[PDB]
DNA sequence: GGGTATTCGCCGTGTACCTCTCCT
RNA sequence: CGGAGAGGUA
DNA sequence: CATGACGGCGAATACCC
């Protein structure tokens, strides 16, 4: 069933796989992350509440005084988004926190409070996220990019040889807290454990164990299994468990019940061991010298002499063992040791370990932490306690503890945030047994080891940093301040918190200037995941492995959309259905397969759990009952793909677009494109500039509507109703009676954005797509945004294209464009630039903005007003004065139009400092703003009054009908007349009460709005006045501009061909664009061909419908043909029944389809070639997609058929107008007299090292010399060269370059005598 | 453009040997001692 | 941009280039180890001139 | 001058300052740095004259 | 086995693509070099190679894991038929590897070029003939059967 | 000197961190405090602390970060010291001495000019007007159209027709240097004769694109104006594209046709079994061209054509031999552009990229530079035309 | 008293161009 | 008009 | 404080006589 609005233009869908899970809200990550940050959390797990609870209470050094946090609240922002953008201020809310100052009684028993002060304190401004996941910082729209970082926890790694000798792998373990120092253990080439705290000098690991109050005997017990030698009389017989002796050769003739089983020289095998199941021999005699290679595991003394015979971890020698035995010791402790699986790493580290007790270990650790500073016992103990065992300085987060326990196979997810002795011991044990070949190292690039921090988490972290900065000051203010009667506001200072928050939101690497070329660019920016930033990677240093597509990226990270160049593999795009779990790990949805039936139950699996299941591929055929029709389905099991039976299968992919991102999901026939060109096309879709008229893609994927709606660039109906009013700037919806709340007018007003510049100086314009009286439903698009057509993303234009060479004008990706494309303004775009004229204070006097400018004629000042500011609507060109300003010396400092920037003045804004007389232009602009504001509080009032009047009319004729009093008694009398109350007006007392409140709401804030309009807005220090002029320019398509499709097929226009010269078909229709076939084969982006064919088919359908519209055919014939068109396909999922439509709806649909029927071809469930040929037949077009073309220049037939179709082309934001630049002479740099750099500075081109090498290779010595001297920092040479050129003398007189003198002076400044010699 | 047990003659011609020492063999087929 | 200045130093100061740029020029000339000269230079030890 | 302009400027300049090295403007890099004609191609003959006069 | 199958598919595709059948003036059917557009582009040398044509119309073939090991099951589809989700995801590994390889090797190439330029910057032809009788002996480069 | 360490104004009234004056400030401060704590006298420990921190200030000013931690400014960024002035990629040597920004330079997006000759480039007239501006001033005063510099500047700003005539006169034979980054070898800079074009994009000759590793999917190139007579003659005699047809790395030709030209020559030189006009006998290439253009014969028809070819003798003169060749119509048509002295068999085959490159190399070896340049231009034109017609 | 193997600190890591914000 | 951060083009 | 880079090389360090 289709709604009335959907009936306008139904895109034909060739998708065959049924859609089980809807595409989620594409901006969920940002909104949810910030909502976690700012919303009240009673549990205190996350957000501002957690940040406060993690630092509060703060207590004095004595502890007599303290602060207790009670609660927090966010106030109403002073300005909303629009005023913040206009005034260039941050859109933020005030943070108001309820604090309590507890002063405790002196000489009291315990913690008794003498007094409590309850106050509310302002702790700064928290920037607020907008409705579309953006932030307004200093008036600029910014996106906080999510960061992919190593999860906190324990991670076991190794370097596969490639460090020392040959093949020696050194295992290591890293405990990474979310907050605190990093604890590393590693194996050296000598198989000794070493410990590193914060990448400092490595120490023996045993020191840490000593620092944990573990003696040598305790350590050896922890990390070794005790073997016993129990001597009765002699012969050194030894008790053992059989499993111990497996692996090594036989040192003695092992005896079984008095009978020898294996003699010397034969290695013990598995059968040898299994023969002792019924042979439980315990005491076994061994040779005396066999003890030589053994280590004693305990501390021993002689019974009463007091002379310790030995200590733990000592080699047992013949003299040692013998004189031990003569002392009557019945048994001796030893360490079980092997060579391959029970290596004595701990014992050898003990040997190396220079410390001998807890104090020595503490001193060594303090020495390593504090190099060169004297150690103290108390200081060392405090430092070691603070390193990993204090909540204030160390914190494993909840995810950190979870990952820590998971890696150690602990069945408790929840735990403390600080390390314990057991945690460190278990980490050491797992590292040791990984060395022993029992475990496996972790994959660093595995998405189960890399998590996502978003805007909320990072904002909370920066807030906590600011809060601890406040804590340091407040603790000393409470301790060393003889406080009495003081309030908690006195101690609290909001400067550090505000500074930290502004630094994060304006200067962080992940706080990025929003890419706002088109809605797709906004969506992609809001969905990017960055491996860079603090705690991440650097693009100069990242290796191949981290940049690669990892198998766990499936369904979580797009393997296609990533930047080219240095940022490749480091910046990624979230997949369509991907989301983060509670721990920040990316998870993707799957359909549960139960008993061979693919159910509709959806489970979101993370990378760790996904590898434990067999998941069927999305392209797997099912039936009505859900069983797999085939018996060997392709599946992914453990990062590998193979075939399984249906019973083996556990899960299935929810969609064929699950793996790709939004931009990749917008590419039709993506499966026929090479991945490199698909990457290029997905990247360039974001660079498309919105054109004069939004044009739907004839060939789409079906994702256009979702992108357009979720981007927020369109006006979407909050509630259903009927269009009560509509004009190019506003839409007024009369809400349906079933969607209105009690006591409201039920009017929805949508004010449209009109011709505002984007972050990239493109035009943001909303125009309504609904008519007067149209019925609208909730979620309906009311106004199209930029690059949006009837709620569908429309990045470019549909172009009739032929694939053929045309006289070299399509050579090397060049594009030939017909002049009709220029005439029809298909790719003409609006660009809005903001120019600022600032009048300041100078040492001499204030700068004056006036129309009296010296040394200019009256003709040059005709476009200015009396104040000296350009009129609205004035057509200006390069050099024209916009704002006349004179700086005293007076000198001409007036703001002029940049060269070749001819445009129209569409807006002028004046900002005046307080105490400054605003000019008459400012006065009239203020008057216009006041009038518009008065209209805003009246026209909105009038419309809401109309809605309330309609509501009161509806209610009053329901049980209280009074026809006469409708006309003989006016509205106001009802409100107050003295009569007995009844059912007639009691209900009106609740619905006209809101009417009276609008008498108390719109008028009450009128004074506030006037005050805001007339207030002198604060400006930069020394700024008297700012005049902002907005210049709007139409950029028409021209040679040098960059065009591209969605398939990576990019090019630069080489010629604007006249229409009579362009290739044309038998009907005389010329093509719009000629593309080179030669760029198809090697690129292997075959989709652009198929789309072309499909595009033709689409146009063909329109070409029929349009015909039936011009011949005024019956609605029945159009019904039949359109039904045939929608029914075409090989068992497509879409079903469109035109019989349900009315005749008017069918006519409207046919009108919307007469320019071509839109086609939806999903990225991996798209139209087949046979379906495309069927659609070509339906439009009476050749199945090959190739037609006979004629040469416009001569009329001659091209000898072979040419692929002619429709391609959806984009104009990229790489216009030749912005790139063309030239300079003869200009300004120069200060330190070096070389020309400035950059087109914006009118700079010169850099002749770098390689250009100099090329000139040297040519032998062009004079050209090189003139580049080095007279075109550069040779001031005298360049002046003389200019004078000679003006005199017609092309001869240079080179001197010494100034930068060489700068180098000489700089080397002198280093105390080095460098000079030129005599001659 | 850059990245990152027996011998059988295949053609017709005479075979020359350099740095060679020849001595008596069991089968008459020379063994290299050089 | 051509006239230089000078700063009179209360005490002699060791040029960093002739000390730390390996091999140490002061160290090689005086046959002392770099660590020793550094301790003396940055006030951690004495030298029996 | 060439070695300092290539790499390890600190070490090369320390060597040169201690040794008191003298640098003849003989190569291409040296003449490029001082903005002279290179001893190659059309400037080659020029340097020849500069050699013969000296 | 899969490499042999890929070779067979490639041979069949090229044999079918490189020839067309034409009627003579005597009404006989005769074979000739194909006038297929893509075959003409490859045969002329203007654009494309046999390997790319095989990806277009044969099978993409065996792919490699990011670690460099070859995936057991090759991509049996071609760009005309269209890949499935798994095949495309597998191919993204090689695509990303190649692009990252280019991006990171360009810097090493530039550094090597700068070092070579410095080491050879001062060398100039300064004489007509020094008169030396020495020289290097040039012979053909021979490695096994082929020269 | 202070002018080598200036203070850049920000927002009109305030200065940013110079990052070098801060180190000097610290050294001066520490030196003065040391000297003053040496006059009043103090416990030796604090005197030695002040001496040590003066040492640290001086060694940070000379080489910040070489020994110990790197002193940090307002931001976490390390301070940039005197040693950093002269070392590294951003140091004085590599950033201002071995390479530098130059005047009389511009840059723009490049498009293909298929009509250009090998020695010509398409240059925007706006770009040329900006680049050659002193020459315009000189000529305007030369014919007394502007008495002073100011009048000439105003005339150029107004863009009068006479100023465009001056621009036409100036650049008649004055070459310009085109460069595309990266300049991997010397052919990345080549000299061309500018031809004024109305657009904003530079038109590049197809054949030199391989030399530049350039295409037309967004590439941009820089243009430079040789000022002096020596530079102009170095551009004409050394760096002009006509002199750079061979590769310095291996000696092979580098202006070899590719893509559309190769496809056009291959298509025109292919033969078909029963093409229209097969079995005809033609007086020469002109008759073949007439038959093809009038539609009476296919381009791939196998025919007999009277071909007159020329061969250099021992003396070096061109001896002419005329004979009937079994060839195609397209091969006979292509024969017209072949310079005298080449065997007819060089075109009597389907011509691929290898064959076309061999044709150009043979032309260069036998006949020299000028016939080679003419032949390359003719090959490019013919290839484009017949690729379009195909 | 001497030689040799291992450790540690320094050096280096493509060119050209374009846009934005922020910086005592 | 210098430095830093972010992004982008070839 | 940052804790995700690594290969090459020379001076110094330690071990082994
Ligand atoms: Mg390119």
Residue numbers in the entry:
A (entry chain F): 2 to 890, 913 to 1342
B (entry chain G): 929 to 932, 948 to 977
C (entry chain G): 99 to 147
D (entry chain G): 1320 to 1373
E (entry chain G): 685 to 831
F (entry chain G): 246 to 635
Mind quoting what the paper says about this structure?
Here we present structural, biochemical and genetic evidence that ppGpp controls Escherichia coli RNA polymerase (RNAP) during elongation via a specific site that is nonfunctional during initiation. The scaffold contains upstream and downstream DNA duplexes interrupted by a 10-nucleotide noncomplementary internal region where template DNA strand binds 16-nucelotide RNA.
The structural alignment centered on the core of RNAP indicated very similar conformations, with an overall root mean squared deviation (r.m.s.d.) for the main chain atoms of 0.23 Å. Inspection of the RNAP regions near the ppGpp-binding site revealed changes in the position of side chains of β′ Arg 362, Arg 417, Lys 615 and ω Arg 3 and small overall movement (2.94 degrees and 0.57 Å) of the ω subunit towards the β′ subunit, which is probably facilitated by the interactions formed between the N-terminal residues of the subunit and the sugar–phosphate moiety of ppGpp. This movement, however, does not appear to translate into conformational changes in the catalytic site, as exemplified by negligible differences in the bridge helices (0.54 degrees and 0.16 Å) and almost identical interactions with the nucleic acid scaffold.
